[PDB]
Amino acid sequence: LKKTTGLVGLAVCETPHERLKILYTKILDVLGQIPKNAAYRKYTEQITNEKLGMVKAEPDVKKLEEQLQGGQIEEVILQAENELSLARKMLRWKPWEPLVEEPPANQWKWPI
Amino acid sequence: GTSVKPIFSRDMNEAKRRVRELYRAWYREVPNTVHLFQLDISVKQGRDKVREMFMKNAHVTDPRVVDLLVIKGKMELEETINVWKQRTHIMRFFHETEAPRPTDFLSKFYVGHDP
Amino acid sequence: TRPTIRPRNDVVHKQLSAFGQYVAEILPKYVQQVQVSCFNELEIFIHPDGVIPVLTFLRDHTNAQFKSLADLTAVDVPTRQNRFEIVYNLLSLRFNSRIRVKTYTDELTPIESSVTVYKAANWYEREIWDMFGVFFANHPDLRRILTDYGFEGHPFRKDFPLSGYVELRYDDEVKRVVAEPVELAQEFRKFDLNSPWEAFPAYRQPPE
Amino acid sequence: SNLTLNFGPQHPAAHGVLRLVMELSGEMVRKCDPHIGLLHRGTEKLIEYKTYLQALPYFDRLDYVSMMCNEQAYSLAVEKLLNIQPPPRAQWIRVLFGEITRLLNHIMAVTTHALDIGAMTPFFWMFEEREKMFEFYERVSGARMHAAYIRPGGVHQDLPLGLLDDIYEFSKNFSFRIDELEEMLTNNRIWRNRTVDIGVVTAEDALNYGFSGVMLRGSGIQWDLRKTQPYDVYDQVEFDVPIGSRGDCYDRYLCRVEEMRQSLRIISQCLNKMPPGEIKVDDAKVSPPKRAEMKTSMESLIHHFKLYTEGYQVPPGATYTAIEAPKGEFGVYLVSDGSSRPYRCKIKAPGFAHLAGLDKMSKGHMLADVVAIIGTQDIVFGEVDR
Amino acid sequence: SDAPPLTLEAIKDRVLYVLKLYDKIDPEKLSVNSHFMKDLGLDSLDQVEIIMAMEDEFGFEIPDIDAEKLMCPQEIVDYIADKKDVYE
Numbered sequence: 001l002k003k004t005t006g007l008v009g010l011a012v013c014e015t016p017h018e019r020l021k022i023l024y025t026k027i028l029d030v031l032g033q034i035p036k037n038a039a040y041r042k043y044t045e046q047i048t049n050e051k052l053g054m055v056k057a058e059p060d061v062k063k064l065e066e067q068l069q070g071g072q073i074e075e076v077i078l079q080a081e082n083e084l085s086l087a088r089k090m091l092r093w094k095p096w097e098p099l100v101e102e103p104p105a106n107q108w109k110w111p112i
Numbered sequence: 113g114t115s116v117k118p119i120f121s122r123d124m125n126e127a128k129r130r131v132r133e134l135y136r137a138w139y140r141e142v143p144n145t146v147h148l149f150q151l152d153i154s155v156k157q158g159r160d161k162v163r164e165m166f167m168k169n170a171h172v173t174d175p176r177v178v179d180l181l182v183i184k185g186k187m188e189l190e191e192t193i194n195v196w197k198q199r200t201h202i203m204r205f206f207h208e209t210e211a212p213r214p215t216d217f218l219s220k221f222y223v224g225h226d227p
Numbered sequence: 228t229r230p231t232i233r234p235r236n237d238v239v240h241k242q243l244s245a246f247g248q249y250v251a252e253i254l255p256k257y258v259q260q261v262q263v264s265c266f267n268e269l270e271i272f273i274h275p276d277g278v279i280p281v282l283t284f285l286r287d288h289t290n291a292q293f294k295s296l297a298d299l300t301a302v303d304v305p306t307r308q309n310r311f312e313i314v315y316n317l318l319s320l321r322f323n324s325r326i327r328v329k330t331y332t333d334e335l336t337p338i339e340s341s342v343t344v345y346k347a348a349n350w351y352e353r354e355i356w357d358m359f360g361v362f363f364a365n366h367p368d369l370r371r372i373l374t375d376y377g378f379e380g381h382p383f384r385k386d387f388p389l390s391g392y393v394e395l396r397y398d399d400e401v402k403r404v405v406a407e408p409v410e411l412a413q414e415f416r417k418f419d420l421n422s423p424w425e426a427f428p429a430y431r432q433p434p435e
Numbered sequence: 436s437n438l439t440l441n442f443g444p445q446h447p448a449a450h451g452v453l454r455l456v457m458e459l460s461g462e463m464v465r466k467c468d469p470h471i472g473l474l475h476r477g478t479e480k481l482i483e484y485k486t487y488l489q490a491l492p493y494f495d496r497l498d499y500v501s502m503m504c505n506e507q508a509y510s511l512a513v514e515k516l517l518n519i520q521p522p523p524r525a526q527w528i529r530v531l532f533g534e535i536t537r538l539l540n541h542i543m544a545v546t547t548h549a550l551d552i553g554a555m556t557p558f559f560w561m562f563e564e565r566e567k568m569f570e571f572y573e574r575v576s577g578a579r580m581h582a583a584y585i586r587p588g589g590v591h592q593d594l595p596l597g598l599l600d601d602i603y604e605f606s607k608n609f610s611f612r613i614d615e616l617e618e619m620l621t622n623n624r625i626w627r628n629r630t631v632d633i634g635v636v637t638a639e640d641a642l643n644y645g646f647s648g649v650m651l652r653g654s655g656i657q658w659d660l661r662k663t664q665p666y667d668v669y670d671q672v673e674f675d676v677p678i679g680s681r682g683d684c685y686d687r688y689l690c691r692v693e694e695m696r697q698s699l700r701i702i703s704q705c706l707n708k709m710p711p712g713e714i715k716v717d718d719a720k721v722s723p724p725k726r727a728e729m730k731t732s733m734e735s736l737i738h739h740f741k742l743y744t745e746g747y748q749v750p751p752g753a754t755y756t757a758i759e760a761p762k763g764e765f766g767v768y769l770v771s772d773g774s775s776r777p778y779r780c781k782i783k784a785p786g787f788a789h790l791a792g793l794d795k796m797s798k799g800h801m802l803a804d805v806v807a808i809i810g811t812q813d814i815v816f817g818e819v820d821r
Numbered sequence: 822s823d824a825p826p827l828t829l830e831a832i833k834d835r836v837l838y839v840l841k842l843y844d845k846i847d848p849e850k851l852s853v854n855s856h857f858m859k860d861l862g863l864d865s866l867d868q869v870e871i872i873m874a875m876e877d878e879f880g881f882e883i884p885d886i887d888a889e890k891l892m893c894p895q896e897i898v899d900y901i902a903d904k905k906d907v908y909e
């Protein structure tokens with residue numbers, strides 16, 4: 001129904017509820033492969049579950065945009081895609097492992 | 113172990129190979145530089161100057177330093193090939209307007225206090 | 228205390244501290260330290276190996292969304308074994324916030340290029356290479372940006388002299404611009420300004 | 436092979452000293468390679484060799500079209516590191532002269548953009564207004580452009596007794612000059628042909644490339660540092676932020692004209708609400724005392740001597756302070772080691788990132804289109820090269 | 822017709838002619854078995870220059886390897902014969 005989202009290069013999305021559901025399900029599937037005790041997994045699962053729950057509970061796009069507080073649901077879709085890509089990259093990186101190579105003795109001492 | 117990480121080369125052999133590739137590229141490029149910049153020097157002079165620059169850093173025994181030197185040499189070659197340098201930049205290698213300074217003790221004693 | 232003294236904001240301080248703890252919890256592999264300055268600026272000190280992951284997290288995380296790289300520069304501290312300090316300033320428009328990410332390197336250790344994360348980095352890294360001599364790996368096109376063609380040295384290092392080593396003039400014998408060792412008609416005059424009395428007791432260092 | 440051409444530095448459309456190496460197929464632009472540093476003066480090292488007061492005039496010469504804005508940004512950074520607060524009258528004067536400076540910058544940008552595209556008259560019409568604002572600058576500071584007026588304590592001097600009346604007289608008439616320029620350019624079909632759909636950039640690309648200011652707002656991004664992160668008294672003034680929808684040259688030109696109108700609005704508000712009081716912080720260990728006190732009392736003379744010889748010490752620490760300068764986000768990363776001289780001062784210029792994106796913006800365009808795109812990025816090379 | 826069938830003798834003659842056109846080698850001391858490193862007293866960069874001269878003369882490129890180990894005229898002749906698949 002809406003035209004001209006207002007951001008150059010961001011096209012208007014038809015049927016955004018389905019797209020958001022697919023994206024959130026994919027994010028959850030990817031997060032399912034991260035260790036349970038990792039902080040990234042639990043934090044991202046929490047926020048994604050809240051967003052999916054509020055998506056499944058509102059059929060009106062304007063009110064959904066108001067509730068998500070995410071700025072123009074097309075940007076919500078873009079942020080979901082970015083989060084899915086980041087989740088894949090973090091699964092590859094595994095940054096939940098302990099710190100490697102503590103810094104030298106006075107590396108961060110200021111002044112001098 | 114000393115636990116150091118490489119830039120490109122694992123040891124001195126790969127570093128020497130990169131040095132040889134850079135030298136080949138510079139040697140090939142010299143005649144084109146003489147033609148394009150309309151230099152009054154000969155091709156032999158340019159290749160001798162190229163050889164002289166390499167010899168200056170011949171003593172270095174660290175592969176990371178050699179790698180960085182090769183990176184800088186490739187940057188300089190890229191500047192020369194694209195004619196980003198001008199004639200003055202190329203001729204700065206030859207120090208044509210600098211009067212020669214004697215290295216003997218007597219000459220230095222006569223001119224000034226500098227050692 | 229009122230008129231001349233800058234007021235402090237404690238809500239932003241608390242929020243920045245909480246987000247610093249959040250980032251440190253999510254990325255224990257690379258985060259070495261987190262600090263919040265008393266004028267409400269948040270910095271995160273990381274191991275160099277985590278330059279690409281951390282930044283990527285900050286750029287793409289739903290709760291972070293730091294999608295603008297405001298600035299990227301280096302600081303030279305010769306007394307440190309790792310001479311150079313690499314500083315990223317990031318801005319989040321979604322949450323109207325700013326964050327600083329810091330790491331370190333020396334003369335012979337490359338830092339991974341962050342052009343894949345932020346396009347804006349492309350020139351900034353070049354400047355860091357030109358002024359400090361820090362090499363960036365996998366840079367699409369790394370070369371001098373600010374200095375003259377063929378310039379030798381990295382002028383922003385502390386041990387580089389202020390007026391440099393060479394100066395330019397026009398020579399009529401060779402009919403061109405030539406370079407020669409610097410000679411100054413008036414030497415720059417060094418001023419010794421520091422007071423012999425301590426100014427700020429809150430920053431006093433232990434007597435070792 | 437493609438034809439390789441040197442565009443500048445000695446070129447009318449090079450905006451100063453710029454070596455644009457272009458690869459062209461006919462007049463189609465295949466590649467742009469900007470070569471800069473022709474105005475690199477090594478400002479940051481020089482600042483490392485000065486006290487905080489001695490380094491202030493360098494910010495006048497960074498972006499020499501918006502001087503007092505750079506002074507304001509540097510002063511705000513030093514104030515933050517000093518944990519002190521300018522008095523209200525100084526802040527109101529700062530915002531008033533910042534808006535006047537924005538007017539100057541926008542006049543320069545729009546008129547020289549039109550000059551490069553081929554319209555020479557509006558330059559002449561608007562540079563008389565520029566000269567009148569230069570007179571305001573000189574009456575407040577004694578210099579037409581390099582004022583050194585805004586300082587980390589506030590402002591150097593108070594206003595002369597008749598300045599506000601003349602500023603009001605200029606402001607009540609500037610809108611007709613804006614209208615005449617608009618009548619010359621906005622609806623002209625040749626101007627629209629030369630500007631519409633030229634140099635289009637998407638919002639995501641603008642964000643990732645480090646753009647700021649109008650270069651974001653033309654693509655629909657709703658961002659403005661005066662509204663989201665106000666600094667002096669910008670939370671006490673009312674104005675609108677112009678937003679584009681096409682992301683091209685024409686929308687950015689419209690945004691700049693509308694920003695000039697909004698600057699007139701803010702200047703009116705600042706003129707009406709100027710408060711009384713002192714113009715620098717009442718702290719003689721930071722701001723110099725008055726001349727009469729310096730010649731009368733012992734403490735005043737001591738503090739004057741020390742502030743003009745050694746300068747004030749700044750507690751150690753690092754800040755990144757940014758403002759909405761007329762060309763975009765202008766920032767300073769300032770590091771203090773506890774002494775009277777800054778340890779490090781990195782300057783962030785919006786033109787740096789904007790010019791770094793020139794090659795992206797010129798894809799599929801011609802030579803004259805690239806000239807227009809150069810004009811639309813609002814580049815001054817004093818800040819780009821530093 | 823095309824060029825005549827190249828033989829080993831022609832390759833040897835051309836290699837020796839190139840080598841004695843090098844200003845840093847005395848023509849009389851040079852033989853097909855003389856070692857650049859020891860008999861002739863040349864360093865690594867001289868060997869690189871000789872390999873580039875061979876590249877120019879025989880019109881084909883020799884990589885850094887397969888050239889870093891050619892230390893006398895006989896090895897260069899053998900390498901050229903192998904690349905050109907010449908048996909006579």
Ligand SMILES: CCCCCCCCCCCC(=O)SCCNC(=O)CCNC(=O)[C@H](O)C(C)(C)COP(=O)(O)O
Pocket residue numbers: 127128131145158161162165166167169170171172173178181182184185188202205864865866
């Ligand atoms: C027109 C004028 C243009 C001038 C352009 C100037 C360009 C300069 C670029 C210089 C790049 C470097 O420094 S590259 C650094 C060069 N030095 C090293 O790598 C250290 C090891 N030295 C050695 O191996 C030998 O002394 C060696 C002589 C190299 C031969 O070696 P071999 O034989 O055992 O193989």
Ligand SMILES: COC1=C(OC)C(=O)C(CC=C(C)C)=C(C)C1=O
Pocket residue numbers: 447448547550555
């Ligand atoms: C109308 O005549 C003039 C020019 O020729 C078009 C100029 O280039 C300039 C220089 C300004 C541009 C941006 C090069 C001036 C000042 C001028 O008056």
